[PDB]
Amino acid sequence: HMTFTIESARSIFPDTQVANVIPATVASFNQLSGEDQLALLWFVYTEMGVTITPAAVNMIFAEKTLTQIQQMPAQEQTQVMCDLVNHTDTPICRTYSSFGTNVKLGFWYQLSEWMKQGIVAPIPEGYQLSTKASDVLQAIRQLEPGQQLTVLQDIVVNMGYTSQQVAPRTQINIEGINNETVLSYMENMNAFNFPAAVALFTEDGALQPPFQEPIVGQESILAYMHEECYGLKLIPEQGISEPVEGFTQIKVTGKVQTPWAGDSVSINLAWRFLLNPQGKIFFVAIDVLASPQELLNMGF
Numbered sequence: 001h002m003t004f005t006i007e008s009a010r011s012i013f014p015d016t017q018v019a020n021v022i023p024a025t026v027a028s029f030n031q032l033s034g035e036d037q038l039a040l041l042w043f044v045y046t047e048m049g050v051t052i053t054p055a056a057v058n059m060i061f062a063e064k065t066l067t068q069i070q071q072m073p074a075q076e077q078t079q080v081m082c083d084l085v086n087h088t089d090t091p092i093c094r095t096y097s098s099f100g101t102n103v104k105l106g107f108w109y110q111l112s113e114w115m116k117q118g119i120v121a122p123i124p125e126g127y128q129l130s131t132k133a134s135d136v137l138q139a140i141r142q143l144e145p146g147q148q149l150t151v152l153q154d155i156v157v158n159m160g161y162t163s164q165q166v167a168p169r170t171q172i173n174i175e176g177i178n179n180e181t182v183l184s185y186m187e188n189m190n191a192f193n194f195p196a197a198v199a200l201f202t203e204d205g206a207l208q209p210p211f212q213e214p215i216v217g218q219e220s221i222l223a224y225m226h227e228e229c230y231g232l233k234l235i236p237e238q239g240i241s242e243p244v245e246g247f248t249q250i251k252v253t254g255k256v257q258t259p260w261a262g263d264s265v266s267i268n269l270a271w272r273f274l275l276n277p278q279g280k281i282f283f284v285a286i287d288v289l290a291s292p293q294e295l296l297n298m299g300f
């Protein structure tokens, strides 16, 4: 007999208002053809109004592949960027799938810079998207920047073909709760003390990133934290705590800022924790919350 499994833990606070327009838009994007995809991504990225810094984040992992692409003629450069978006089995697509999330993003950032400088073949002057791609572009363009950044990240991480400094903890407050395991988690994540944060989990515990599967076990969670969590700033604001079957479930809402955009952009999140009777994190889900505008729209 078990009171909770990882699977059943995923459904805690089931009426959380998740921004399902994000994966909805990604699914629509994945129905478009390679050329429409690349041109759409160029317009999203360039028209977002957000300055992207690589500086606060990595690139040494991508440099050999980047040099390769830089040396290719324009015809081959564009084909490579089509293999990536189309998920074609190629050496470069397999190498890309081994990059960490932030390495993938740095990869694409450098190509974006080279396209501006005419070192990498640009999107053709005036290339006209299909009507369908034009509808996907406009839905992306309407989203708040932080949600567009999430769309892009999700698309970038899924391209290709699949075959640092610790601060001391500083005090943080969350109105409405007094849970030390939650506060330890948030403060250790802000300090980039990822071994300390992971130590709060049960050995069989999981962390569920937004719109992704649970990452199970401390070794895996730590690797993920190394890959994706450096330079994040977590700004939990408020919470509720409820006892359930001798466990505690805690929902916290607030924001994160990514080092890609600094303090110019804040993404609205929920964190959904299930703690065991000993105060260990059995499960935590992070969700991107729907805006008031998106809730309205996805009714009426």
Ligand SMILES: CC1=C(/C=C/C(C)=C/C=C/C(C)=C/C=C/C=C(C)/C=C/C=C(C)/C=C/C2=C(C)C(=O)CCC2(C)C)C(C)(C)CCC1
Residues within 6 Å of the ligand: 038, 039, 041, 042, 045, 046, 052, 105, 108, 109, 110, 111, 112, 115, 146, 149, 150, 152, 153, 156, 189, 208, 209, 210, 228, 229, 232, 234, 256, 258, 260, 267, 269, 286
């Ligand atoms: C492709 C492509 C191009 C270039 C694209 C470029 C350049 C894109 C750059 C995009 C970037 C830079 C996006 C960055 C997004 C970052 C996000 C969205 C981060 C969100 C993080 C969150 C939400 C983390 C929350 C979490 C919390 C709070 C926890 O407690 C646990 C850990 C974790 C779950 C991590 C060009 C133009 C050439 C055209 C051709 C195709």
